[PDB]
Scaffold this active site. Sequence first.
Site, PDB file in Angstrom:
ATOM      1  N   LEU A   1      -4.364  44.317 -62.064  1.00  0.00           N
ATOM      2  CA  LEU A   1      -3.081  44.549 -62.691  1.00  0.00           C
ATOM      3  C   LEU A   1      -2.187  43.642 -61.817  1.00  0.00           C
ATOM      4  O   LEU A   1      -2.505  43.329 -60.649  1.00  0.00           O
ATOM      5  CB  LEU A   1      -2.763  46.067 -62.577  1.00  0.00           C
TER       6      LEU A   1
ATOM      7  N   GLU B   1      -3.062  56.448 -43.630  1.00  0.00           N
ATOM      8  CA  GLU B   1      -3.175  55.007 -43.783  1.00  0.00           C
ATOM      9  C   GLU B   1      -2.876  54.380 -42.433  1.00  0.00           C
ATOM     10  O   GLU B   1      -1.948  54.828 -41.726  1.00  0.00           O
ATOM     11  CB  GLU B   1      -2.174  54.553 -44.830  1.00  0.00           C
TER      12      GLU B   1
ATOM     13  N   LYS C   1      -4.774  47.770 -50.274  1.00  0.00           N
ATOM     14  CA  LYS C   1      -5.052  49.065 -49.661  1.00  0.00           C
ATOM     15  C   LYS C   1      -4.121  50.173 -50.138  1.00  0.00           C
ATOM     16  O   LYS C   1      -4.607  51.269 -50.436  1.00  0.00           O
ATOM     17  CB  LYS C   1      -4.951  48.936 -48.151  1.00  0.00           C
ATOM     18  N   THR C   2      -2.807  49.953 -50.270  1.00  0.00           N
ATOM     19  CA  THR C   2      -1.939  51.020 -50.734  1.00  0.00           C
ATOM     20  C   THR C   2      -2.060  51.263 -52.235  1.00  0.00           C
ATOM     21  O   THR C   2      -1.752  52.377 -52.682  1.00  0.00           O
ATOM     22  CB  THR C   2      -0.492  50.691 -50.336  1.00  0.00           C
TER      23      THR C   2
ATOM     24  N   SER D   1       4.775  48.294 -39.711  1.00  0.00           N
ATOM     25  CA  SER D   1       5.611  47.208 -39.254  1.00  0.00           C
ATOM     26  C   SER D   1       5.830  46.352 -40.497  1.00  0.00           C
ATOM     27  O   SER D   1       5.004  46.355 -41.430  1.00  0.00           O
ATOM     28  CB  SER D   1       4.905  46.435 -38.134  1.00  0.00           C
TER      29      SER D   1
ATOM     30  N   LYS E   1       1.504  57.622 -42.928  1.00  0.00           N
ATOM     31  CA  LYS E   1       1.282  56.304 -42.357  1.00  0.00           C
ATOM     32  C   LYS E   1       2.027  56.346 -41.032  1.00  0.00           C
ATOM     33  O   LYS E   1       3.213  56.028 -40.966  1.00  0.00           O
ATOM     34  CB  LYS E   1       1.846  55.210 -43.310  1.00  0.00           C
TER      35      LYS E   1
ATOM     36  N   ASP F   1       4.979  50.310 -48.089  1.00  0.00           N
ATOM     37  CA  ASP F   1       3.726  51.058 -48.178  1.00  0.00           C
ATOM     38  C   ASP F   1       3.961  52.531 -47.906  1.00  0.00           C
ATOM     39  O   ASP F   1       3.515  53.385 -48.675  1.00  0.00           O
ATOM     40  CB  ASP F   1       2.679  50.516 -47.175  1.00  0.00           C
TER      41      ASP F   1
ATOM     42  N   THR G   1      -6.681  41.961 -45.289  1.00  0.00           N
ATOM     43  CA  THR G   1      -5.258  42.150 -45.530  1.00  0.00           C
ATOM     44  C   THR G   1      -4.858  42.159 -47.000  1.00  0.00           C
ATOM     45  O   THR G   1      -3.991  42.897 -47.468  1.00  0.00           O
ATOM     46  CB  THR G   1      -4.494  41.050 -44.740  1.00  0.00           C
ATOM     47  N   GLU G   2      -5.513  41.332 -47.797  1.00  0.00           N
ATOM     48  CA  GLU G   2      -5.125  41.176 -49.188  1.00  0.00           C
ATOM     49  C   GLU G   2      -5.930  42.089 -50.096  1.00  0.00           C
ATOM     50  O   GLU G   2      -6.096  41.757 -51.269  1.00  0.00           O
ATOM     51  CB  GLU G   2      -5.319  39.702 -49.585  1.00  0.00           C
TER      52      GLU G   2
END
Lengths: 220, 220
Positions: free
Chosen positions: B206, B115, B15-16, B41, B37, B54, B11-12
């Site tokens: 970043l 995605e 990805k985007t 949710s 996408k 996202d 999850t962390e």
Amino acid sequence: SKRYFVTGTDTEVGKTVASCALLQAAKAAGYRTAGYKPVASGSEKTPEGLRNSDALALQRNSSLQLDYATVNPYTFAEPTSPHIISAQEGRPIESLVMSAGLRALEQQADWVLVEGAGGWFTPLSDTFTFADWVTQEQLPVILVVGVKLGCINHAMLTAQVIQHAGLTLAGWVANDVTPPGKRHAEYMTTLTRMIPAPLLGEIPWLAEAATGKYINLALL
Amino acid sequence: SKRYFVTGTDTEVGKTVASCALLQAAKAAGYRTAGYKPVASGSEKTPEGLRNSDALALQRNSSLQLDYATVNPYTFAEPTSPHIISAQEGRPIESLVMSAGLRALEQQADWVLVEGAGGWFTPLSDTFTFADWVTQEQLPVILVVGVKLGCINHAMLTAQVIQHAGLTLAGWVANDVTPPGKRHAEYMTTLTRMIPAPLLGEIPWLAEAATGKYINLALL
């Protein structure tokens, strides 16, 4: 002896909380128990040597009086992958020593719990992972899953890969790693539907001791 | 059009961040690009409706001017699994609408990035997961991996399962989700050895914009 390997779906799932619960329930059932964590990294220095807290917990939760090195042959201080620190320290992690240590426990204990050193695919050398040893030993696997959204995907991934190795998924343990949240029941339902093995019990959220009671050992 | 599905290892993993980098590099190569996408949710309310950040990022990073609903047909406000909120809201997530939305993008764009809505096995109904749609569409997969210890296991799990579905693992992107740490190089080495697909680039840490430069699109 009955033997089981315990693996978690992710790092924060409280895997040794579930391992102490499992050992406690096995002791209450009248088994001579032993915890075994062949490889551990992330250790504290003491006058006797490096002790890792997860292996200490397995040791104190075993019904048998065991020396530390019997529970944990390979202890590394830095919390990183075993193949990295083994190669840095010049100490090969030997499959035969890992297997000999399990045999030594089998001549004393009749219910042995084996804990890995990270997730399913933890590298032990450049050509050998923890999964290769578990497959070699033909250990039944028990999955520990944190009741959280990301773990639906993680549990399903891990389960598929174990089954693909032709190993038995003996069961799973739900660990409540956060305070009660909004979708707790729906998450428990989805996980029970998707993991092809019996749910052995659910350990409630505690800040993180007698937890044997949450495990139904009759399902193993 | 060339089409790719992007999935993360956890999850962390940003990805985007990797999806915007990929779209930026495709635009610089002269492709008419579109982000897609289908299911999102975790959305904010606006005068126009629910917008998920996202999908907004995919929309602004597409070379084509696209309406929001074209980028994201299914938008749910609560950040939980799509099968839960779809069933709560009474709005089925339809495989044919997800596929129609991709076709509509293919008549305008010649490089489309898709995605998902969570990890590989994100349930969309009780009998249908995101993996089933990707397999049905025969999309090449690009894995995004955070350079962290737990992701060695997660990347290997995800990679094995995709290959088992008979899909192509087109490549992977390393995302530096923390400040430089002690075992960064050894982690990058282990991941490059174990993931059976080309490393497409590494995005530096970043706090979290022009990131197309970190992606070598010639490897896809």
